[PDB]
């Protein structure tokens, strides 16, 4: 049995939230939150909230253990981006993109 | 009646991308480069389809020349005497016998040695 939890649309570049997802992959939940409460990244408290919500999904729906839990998969898909504009010199103007992410995390127990 | 194109331009473009399966880089994704690589593959296969009958032929000669120097003889001489004794044998068969039943080959050398 396994539990999952998706955020769906987050104001943060997907390439910047993929640098903190390669540190809590294939580890214990207890050590996972500890590593997320030490990194000084901008996407550290966001991932923690999702990871903390996924651990509560297998405590009321499946009512399983918490100490004997391991994060199985953890990725982040791209989402819709907003188009902006920035005035440059000589009248010409450039373009700005505001991409979003779809952070997802599934928790298992080391067995299918 | 206006005949708008569709389900015919992608059906023929999906048949050229399937032929370029196993290429490195974007030569198995983009169709503009896949067509060029598939257009050269056919020109190569046909060009080395006649070069395969020259490599194997040269291979047998090298093998027969190495199995003829053990009996104090030369390929040129061995062949010359093998044609003077009226013997019709392929170069692929001669080398096949030398690698297998050595006794047979040994006797053949003697037959082409007294025919000189």
């Amino acid at each position: 049995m396994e539990a999952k939890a998706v955020a769906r649309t987050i104001r943060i570049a997907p390439r910047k939230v993929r640098l903190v997802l390669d540190l809590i992959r294939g580890k214990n939940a207890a050590e996972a939150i500890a590593i997320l409460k030490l990194t000084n990244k901008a996407s550290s408290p966001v991932i923690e909230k999702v990871l903390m919500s996924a651990l509560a999904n297998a405590e009321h729906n499946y009512d399983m253990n918490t100490d004997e839990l391991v994060v199985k998969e953890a990725y982040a898909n791209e989402g819709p981006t907003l188009k902006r504009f920035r005035p440059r010199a000589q009248g010409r103007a450039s373009a700005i993109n505001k991409r979003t992410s779809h952070i997802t995390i599934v928790v298992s127990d080391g067995k299918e | 009646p206006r005949v708008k194109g569709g389900t015919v331009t992608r059906a023929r473009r999906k048949k050229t991308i399937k032929l370029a399966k196993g290429y490195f880089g974007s030569k198995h994704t983009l169709y503009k480069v896949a067509k060029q690589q598939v257009m050269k593959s056919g020109q190569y296969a046909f060009r080395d389809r006649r070069q395969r009958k020259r490599d194997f032929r040269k291979l047998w000669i090298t093998r027969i020349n190495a199995a003829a120097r053990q009996h104090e003889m030369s390929y040129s001489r061995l062949m010359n005497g093998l044609k003077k004794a009226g013997i019709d044998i392929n170069r692929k068969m001669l080398s096949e016998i030398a690698i297998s039943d050595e006794k047979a080959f040994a006797q053949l050398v003697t037959k082409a040695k007294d025919a000189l």
Binding site: - | M39, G42, Q43, I87, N90, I97, Q107
Partner: protein, 102 residues
């Protein structure tokens, strides 16, 4: 034991109990073709002959007689506007040896 027969336009080597592929023969499926042109015969009695050995190969049962794999032949010019595309399927006959005469 092993003989050196020659059919179609080349020469082969039977082992008295091994399947071989040759050119389209003038027979039918489940027939019996016999090669009357041996160039060499050794293994137990090294017997080499000039034109032949006066010993036609034992009749070999004929099996599958269909077409081969399809190959595509393509060719084009450099800066010229010329190209050609065709398909080929060389026919063949499958048979197995069981005996041998000398």
């Amino acid at each position: 034991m092993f003989a050196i027969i020659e059919t179609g336009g080349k020469q082969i080597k039977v082992e008295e109990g091994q399947e071989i592929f040759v050119e389209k023969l003038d027979v039918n499926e489940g027939d019996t073709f016999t090669f009357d042109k041996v160039l060499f015969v050794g293994g137990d009695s090294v017997k080499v002959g000039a034109p032949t050995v006066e010993g036609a190969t034992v009749t070999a049962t004929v099996n599958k007689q269909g077409r081969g794999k399809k190959i595509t032949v393509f060719t084009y010019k450099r800066r010229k506007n010329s190209k050609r595309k065709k398909g080929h399927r060389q026919p063949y006959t499958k048979l197995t040896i069981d005996k041998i005469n000398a």
